[PDB]
Design an enzyme around this catalytic site. Sequence first.
Site, PDB file in Angstrom:
ATOM      1  CG  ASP B 166      -1.933   1.120   1.255  1.00 41.64           C
ATOM      2  OD1 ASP B 166      -2.432   1.530   0.185  1.00 41.64           O
ATOM      3  OD2 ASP B 166      -2.241   1.611   2.359  1.00 41.64           O
ATOM      4  CD  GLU B 417      -0.039  -5.527   6.979  1.00 44.77           C
ATOM      5  OE1 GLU B 417      -0.259  -5.350   5.757  1.00 44.77           O
ATOM      6  OE2 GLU B 417      -0.578  -4.844   7.871  1.00 44.77           O
ATOM      7  CE1 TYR B 473      -4.764   0.462  10.095  1.00 48.19           C
ATOM      8  CE2 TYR B 473      -3.779  -1.683   9.719  1.00 48.19           C
ATOM      9  CZ  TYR B 473      -3.680  -0.308   9.754  1.00 48.19           C
ATOM     10  OH  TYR B 473      -2.515   0.339   9.434  1.00 48.19           O
ATOM     11  CD  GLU B 511       0.845  -1.053   9.442  1.00 49.33           C
ATOM     12  OE1 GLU B 511      -0.332  -1.129   9.008  1.00 49.33           O
ATOM     13  OE2 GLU B 511       1.856  -1.343   8.766  1.00 49.33           O
TER      14      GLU B 511
HETATM   15  O1  LIG Z   1      -4.133  -0.357   4.913  1.00 51.53           O
HETATM   16  C1  LIG Z   1      -3.270   0.413   5.543  1.00 51.53           C
HETATM   17  O2  LIG Z   1      -3.487   1.602   5.752  1.00 51.53           O
HETATM   18  C2  LIG Z   1      -1.983  -0.193   6.000  1.00 51.53           C
HETATM   19  C3  LIG Z   1      -2.197  -1.653   6.365  1.00 51.53           C
HETATM   20  N1  LIG Z   1      -0.922  -2.243   6.768  1.00 51.53           N
HETATM   21  C4  LIG Z   1       0.199  -2.089   5.856  1.00 51.53           C
HETATM   22  C5  LIG Z   1       0.377  -0.621   5.477  1.00 51.53           C
HETATM   23  O3  LIG Z   1       1.421  -0.524   4.508  1.00 51.53           O
HETATM   24  C6  LIG Z   1      -0.918  -0.066   4.918  1.00 51.53           C
HETATM   25  O4  LIG Z   1      -0.727   1.294   4.536  1.00 51.53           O
END
Ligand SMILES: O=C(O)[C@H]1CNC[C@@H](O)[C@@H]1O
Lengths: 596, 596
Positions: B166, B417, B473, B511
């Site tokens: 991404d 990931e 997330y 993250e």
């Molecule tokens: O989906 C996203 O915002 C992130 C999810 N994990 C990996 C990131 O590179 C990505 O930008």
Amino acid sequence: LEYSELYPIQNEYRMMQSLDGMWKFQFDPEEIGKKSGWENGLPAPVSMPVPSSFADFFTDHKERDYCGDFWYETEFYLPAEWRNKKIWLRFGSITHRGTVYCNGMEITSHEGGFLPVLADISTVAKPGQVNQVVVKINNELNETSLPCGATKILNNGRKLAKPYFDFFNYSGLQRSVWVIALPEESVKDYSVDYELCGTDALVKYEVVTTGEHPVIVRLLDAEGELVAETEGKEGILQVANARLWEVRNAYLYQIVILITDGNGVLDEYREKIGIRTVRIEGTKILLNDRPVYLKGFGKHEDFPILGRGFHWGIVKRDFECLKWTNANCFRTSHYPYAEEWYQFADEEGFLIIDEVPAVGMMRSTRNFVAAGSGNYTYFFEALTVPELLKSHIADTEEMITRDKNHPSVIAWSLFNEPETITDYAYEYFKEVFAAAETYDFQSRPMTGAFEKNSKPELCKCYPLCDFICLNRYYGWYISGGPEIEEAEELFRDEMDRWKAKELNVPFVFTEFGTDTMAGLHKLPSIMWSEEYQKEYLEMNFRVFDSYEFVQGELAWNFADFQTTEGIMRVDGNHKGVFTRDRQPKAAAVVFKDRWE
Amino acid sequence: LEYSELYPIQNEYRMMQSLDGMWKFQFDPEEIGKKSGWENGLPAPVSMPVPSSFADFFTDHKERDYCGDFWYETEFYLPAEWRNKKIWLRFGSITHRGTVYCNGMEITSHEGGFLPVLADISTVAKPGQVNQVVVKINNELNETSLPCGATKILNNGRKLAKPYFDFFNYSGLQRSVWVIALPEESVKDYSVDYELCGTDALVKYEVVTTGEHPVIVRLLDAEGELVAETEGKEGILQVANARLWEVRNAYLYQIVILITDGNGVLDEYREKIGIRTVRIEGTKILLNDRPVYLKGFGKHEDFPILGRGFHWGIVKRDFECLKWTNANCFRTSHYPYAEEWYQFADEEGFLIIDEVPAVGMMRSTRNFVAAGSGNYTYFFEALTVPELLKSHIADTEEMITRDKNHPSVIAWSLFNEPETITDYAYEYFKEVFAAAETYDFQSRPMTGAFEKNSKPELCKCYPLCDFICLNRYYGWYISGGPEIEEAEELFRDEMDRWKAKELNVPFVFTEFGTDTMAGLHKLPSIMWSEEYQKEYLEMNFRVFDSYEFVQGELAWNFADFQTTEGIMRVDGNHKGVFTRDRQPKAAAVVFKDRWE
Ligand SMILES: O=C(O)[C@H]1CNC[C@@H](O)[C@@H]1O
Ligand SMILES: O=C(O)[C@H]1CNC[C@@H](O)[C@@H]1O
């Protein structure tokens, strides 16, 4: 008044029919309508929603910016059963001035764009037939009516409104229109005033009717139960264990006013009212004998596309936002709002400072709008001011007569940012304040909002006020941005001067704010950013909290709103704490947390 | 390595000259450059800044999106006085792979777009003359090199990069380029490792040179005073009353490595280092024997127009923002950054998790990018994975050799990931972790960032880690918005499962975030609004704080950044806490206040 300001109701004696919808509409740039018979029907109309401001529908500048005469028309079927009634057209407002025709006949005219216009069509009404209403409206601005401004004629003859005030010159039929039927002998006005007697309360009243038959007055509680009853056009209702209307905790009784002839009832008027007292005691604003600190905003009647057009949805969203901030008060900057706003404030327990449209009376602004192109020598105040005073007093009388019986209305604001530093201004405002007190059965607190030009050393008008409202922009117009520390020093210097006067009256800040563009973020902050709005507000709070006599804070503004376009206004005024579609900027939570 | 990763310096023995500036540049869509002699000069070049990514300069799609072979060229005057030196071209990086030519001669090739490329031009260099460098670069993505993706051929033959990751496929010469001169016998590598002995410290070291002459190693304090000295290519420097490098409180010694022949000095290498230890003890991350809780962000090398182009100004602003949030740590998501970032972290006392570009190894993403148009049956992992492993290990070796001596670098992240739920993935990563430990003289903590697919019941790879980094997330991709209460339940359910495993290792969230469009405000909040970002973060914090073993939180992302365009990316990734031009959204203060 030669008509009633009472909100219309539907019962056995009184009838009402809404005329809201799509009306016919036609601009009259050549001013030919009346000599051309337009009062009998517009020759080439377009459709126009009512209620609404007309401006923002159109896709071309000349229609949006239209200034001058323009006409509305609709037709309505009048029920045959209204035959034996007094039949009136009731406009929530006609902005700014107009003449009402019905079935081709001139009925009445009105000056002032923010209060009801009542037109008695009894003599021309045709019950059991289609009837016609045509209205000639004019939206020019001048210095003999409110709000004040000028009208510029462009080279082609086209008129352009030039306000002396910071809001867009929206106009048209901005509030609902009704046709109503009243009994031939009817309740025209009434007034209530309250006294607290321990657990009990007294509701003193007066009733004005259009006849000589006896009056009976009853008071019902929120459940419809009779709690008091008396006879006479003047009297006192004694309420045992009264449930007082409280800030953010309303309770509403219903007053019921009957005209009788012994055999039966001739008319019945009912309205919700709230038992509450308001008075100023030293530096305190007392609601039901307890101090209240005002927390809230100046607002506008302003919303996308509708302009100032009334809609209950705007009321509902705005009150939900107000409650979310923990506000308790708003000022009707800078004109009386649609009646429905006050009805809702009554229900929600909000406090209202009700403001007449006496805005645009600052000389520097007038001179500026004249210097544009172009004039620096010719002004004629000696001639216009006496006419302006008459208009201002008339609007004041109408506002107070319309709004006095709302428990929410706790004060009258009789001006926003006029000249106040001459003896002439004192004499002018003395007359306005005298008139207000005469018209208000409750003689509740009177005030006005002062601009910084009204220095404590120079202002001749603050002694007329029961409490003093200040609009200040230390940190925006004065020493903004990198100079904000200087702004705070200047603000404290001014407030120290007010303090040293030892006036022993409450001060309320009725305006303070910064233009803030949603999404503009900066670290460190800059003027126009969301972060600067927060920092400015924090600085202002520190100042407010340094003075005992400061007893309220109403931020400018609740929401971003439309203004005349120009180099200082980026799609209107962005001093909103909320966006125009009613969503919070970062500063909204600052208020929420402080006011909690 | 057959070259040195050491950052270039200028002294009596070593010289350096920057080649940064406007280079010549030419796309090679037909892949004709080498057979056409472009290594001797580009036939129809345009100008291209170095350092920079090439993409965002152009005004047309095909140039921005160019994928395939493209060439750079410049010329430089080589000082005559460099005659008797080993002369090298040093590229901070060449993205993604390339072949370096000098004076028409092929010098070296490199695979991997985020680590230095060293080209020994000693045999072709012309001291006292103008020299030429030409580089053939390719920016395609595949499954045998990092980061992973595919290359799609459009109907016209035009190539298009299809990342499995991404972030936008920026490429070119994104970091500074030097030409340097080294002594014929030089310091090629060294390693330091630290032991704390009360008030004192030991600096264990190894030095690799290109010859057999004796080595002397000295340590200077921050004032340049000698605090320790020893002899030999392996040894220990004893430091009395050592001033330790501390989190957000750096202290840097200077190591000085001399090669001598008795008569004089042959080479001198100097670099700033910081005495500090890092180890994992149970669920704690210990810095100098005291637990530290990681607070910060994943970042990118990303800035308007420059793309990934290095600039000290971006470093300075970013560190000021980081300090303002009270952060202490960042991860180099998802590739090693320019060396200067680490030099600055060393100075500012920031902790770095240094990440190799092993991103894009999730099967579902691969399959998705293949299904687009079109493929659902043909994949060849059995063949590509062994080559991918070699590339991954090579990049790991280069990263660790380059970065090991920065006190800021406290951990290696060996993936972001990937698939981890098969024994095959375990065997793959076992080799990578083994290689990392072999190359790191300090054997510091090793980890990788896991996607939610790596369920606690399924993942075979977390036991390789010294601490576990989770990307989650819950409240964005899983049960977002109106379902956020469910998201919290799901998050706690997962963390309860990790808890019940009683692994006794620290967990760090590497993250968590929500796309947030600056200026999008809503009450109540919606996904994409600034308010939702705040609420999501508050929910995540409640979860983090419920588990003892959670010892760090790095938000995704420090700033909005560029991605491939698509229906899920509104001008890149908007999960930034800051905007792309480094200004805070509302959520930035949430972090500031929590991390204080
Ligand atoms: O989906 C996203 O915002 C992130 C999810 N994990 C990996 C990131 O590179 C990505 O930008
Ligand atoms: O300048 C401003 O923002 C305000 C100043 N006081 C009067 C308001 O109508 C006006 O909008």
